[PDB]
Amino acid sequence: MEKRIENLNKKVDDGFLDIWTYNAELLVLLENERTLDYHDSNVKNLYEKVRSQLKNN
Amino acid sequence: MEKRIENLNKKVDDGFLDIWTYNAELLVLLENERTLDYHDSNVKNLYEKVRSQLKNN
Amino acid sequence: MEKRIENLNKKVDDGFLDIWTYNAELLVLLENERTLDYHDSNVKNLYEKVRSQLKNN
Numbered sequence: 076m077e078k079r080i081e082n083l084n085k086k087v088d089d090g091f092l093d094i095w096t097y098n099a100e101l102l103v104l105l106e107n108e109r110t111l112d113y114h115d116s117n118v119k120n121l122y123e124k125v126r127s128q129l130k131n132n
Numbered sequence: 133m134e135k136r137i138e139n140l141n142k143k144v145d146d147g148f149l150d151i152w153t154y155n156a157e158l159l160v161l162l163e164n165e166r167t168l169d170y171h172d173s174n175v176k177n178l179y180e181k182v183r184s185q186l187k188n189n
Numbered sequence: 190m191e192k193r194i195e196n197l198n199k200k201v202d203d204g205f206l207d208i209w210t211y212n213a214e215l216l217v218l219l220e221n222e223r224t225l226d227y228h229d230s231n232v233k234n235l236y237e238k239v240r241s242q243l244k245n246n
Contacts, residue, residue, distance in 0.1 A: 079194050080136050083201065087140065088167050090205050091147050097212060097238050098154060104231055110224050117161055124154050136192050144197065148204050155211060167224050174218055181211050 088132060095128040145189060152185040202246060209242040 102121055105111050111118045159178055162168050168175045216235055219225050225232045 080140065083194065083198055085142075086178055086198075087144055087147070087201055089199070091151075093238070093242065094151055094205075095206055096233070100231075100235060100238075101216075103133075104225055104229075104235070108224060110165060111161055115161075117157075121154070121157060121161070122148070124157075126149065137197065141197055141200075144201055144204070148208075151208055159215075167222060168218055172218075174214075178211070178214060178218070181207070181214075185207065 091128070092132045095125060095132065099125045099129060148185070149189045152182060152189065155188060156182045205242070206246045209239060209246065213239045213243060 102111075102119055106118070107126050111121075113119070113122075142168055159168075163170050163175070168178075170176070170179075216225075216239055220227050220232070225235075227233070227236075
């Protein structure tokens with residue numbers, strides 16, 4: 076019998092991982108082009124959010 | 133006893149809030165650098181999506 | 190009676206669609222400004238992730 080709640084929890088975790096992994100990859104490309112300055116506290120704040128989310132997943 | 137569906141609903145809402153809050157913060161940094169022009173209707177359309185999602189959460 | 194698991198599954202699918210649609214729209218604006226180079230394999234990798242996610246939803 077289908078474990079509906081376990082499967083939906085796994086779908087949410089996996090989906091959140093894919094979303095935060097994409098956010099990390101875009102942010103590293105924007106920092107490499109220098110679009111955003113890694114020295115700026117507002118940019119550091121973005122980086123810390125993505126990092127926090129990936130370690131949590 | 134664990135309220136599994138209530139807890140998974142709270143996890144989804146909280147996760148969506150964190151994702152849309154990040155989208156808003158990146159978009160304001162890209163508009164401040166003028167990478168995207170706030171005058172452009174396609175950029176306004178992004179802004180309205182993030183705004184709609186944050187008010188809904 | 191409320192179909193709680195069916196409704197939470199629909200909320201997750203719809204939310205993921207809105208998140209990946211936003212990612213696609215931002216990436217096309219950043220490629221149009223040439224912030225990111227569509228010729229770069231790392232940028233192609235972003236594009237393929239968003240594309241994969243939208244076709245799956």
